[PDB]
Design a protein around this ligand. Structure first.
Ligand SMILES: O=C(O)C[C@H](c1ccc2c(c1)OCCO2)c1ccc2ccc(OCC(=O)NC3CCCCCC3)cc2c1
Length: 290
């Protein structure tokens, strides 16, 4: 009990410093301590009850700087602290957590599209590089299932991608998995039960509302119910057995809508609205603040 969905950063006209937290139990939203540096295209994750904001870019009227930052937020103090920075800036990054360690995957730095991957150790406040992916990927979706790390879709600098790959930590090795049915850049990617879900994204032409899921046992991607809204660069997380998607860009608007997927009924329902429309947010779940 007492866990909240946190949304950090994002983009609307410019990159944003907002930290806001939604309580699915009573519908409430809390505005919390701003990020020190506004960022979009960042990823959020949680280790040991601390919320981490990783990478992104600060888009401002007076410049656009890609971020190597790792900042950590303590709900007990409502304060952000700087952690050790990554080896390179990573805009439109994907992250995943295995066994208390944060993996930062891919992302862009200027015109460079990274294949490189690095691993953070909270107990040592240190980053170290691991094996790079087989494909350069920005706007990549990353999730962890059964202590394996998945990198799904993205953009390699020339083509948007339906391909996907799996990292095996004990061999420090990446291998291709079955590609998705759909090209998706900027999808929301998460894990629910034994499947990796890829929701929305941009296929090169239109923002998508389709959702597909990868069953690790069958190695197949299957479509599930589509979302109510087309969305790319959306926030995504899982909480009490349901997927929550937040925000994104639908082609026309920066969405404020939050939708919830129930796998048992295979339905999406609109559950709340963010305080303002935005895309490119980092999302993660941890205990209530204060
Ligand atoms: O396919 C690609 O080249 C990359 C892909 C993308 C680029 C251009 C697009 C697009 C999607 O579909 C909307 C119209 O053209 C992408 C993927 C992930 C992102 C994550 C965060 C993120 O954070 C800043 C952000 O939200 N930017 C927003 C305005 C500019 C468009 C990008 C989105 C809205 C941005 C991401 C962008």
């Amino acid at each position: 009990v007492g866990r909240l969905i946190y949304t950090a950063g994002g983009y609307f006209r410019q990159s944003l410093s907002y930290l806001e937290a939604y309580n699915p139990s009573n519908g409430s939203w809390l505005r919390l301590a701003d990020l020190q540096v506004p960022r979009s295209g960042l990823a959020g994750c949680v280790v040991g009850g601390l919320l981490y904001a990783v990478g992104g870019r600060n888009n401002s009227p007076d410049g656009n700087t890609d971020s190597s930052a790792l900042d950590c937020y303590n709900p007990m103090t409502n304060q952000w602290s700087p952690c050790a920075s990554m080896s390179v800036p990573r805009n439109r990054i994907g992250v995943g957590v295995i066994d208390g360690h944060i993996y930062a995957v891919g992302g862009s730095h200027g015109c460079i599209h990274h294949s490189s991957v690095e691993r953070y150790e909270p107990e040592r406040d240190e980053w170290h590089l691991v094996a790079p992916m087989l494909t350069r990927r920005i706007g990549v979706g990353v999730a962890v299932l059964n202590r394996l790390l998945y990198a799904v879709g993205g953009f390699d600098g020339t083509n948007r991608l339906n391909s996907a790959e799996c990292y095996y930590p004990e061999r420090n090795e990446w291998r291709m998995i079955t590609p998705m049915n759909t090209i998706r850049s900027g999808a929301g990617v998460c894990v629910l039960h034994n499947c990796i879900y890829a929701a929305g994204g941009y296929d090169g032409q239109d923002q998508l509302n389709s959702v597909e899921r990868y069953d690790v046992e069958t190695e197949t991607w299957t479509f599930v119910a589509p979302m109510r809204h087309h969305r790319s660069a959306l926030g995504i997380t899982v909480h009490q057995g349901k997927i929550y998607v937040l925000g994104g860009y639908d082609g026309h608007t920066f969405l404020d809508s939050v939708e919830c997927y129930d796998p048992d009924s295979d339905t999406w329902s609109e559950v709340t609205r963010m305080t303002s429309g935005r895309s490119g947010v980092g999302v993660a779940v941890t205990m209530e603040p204060c």
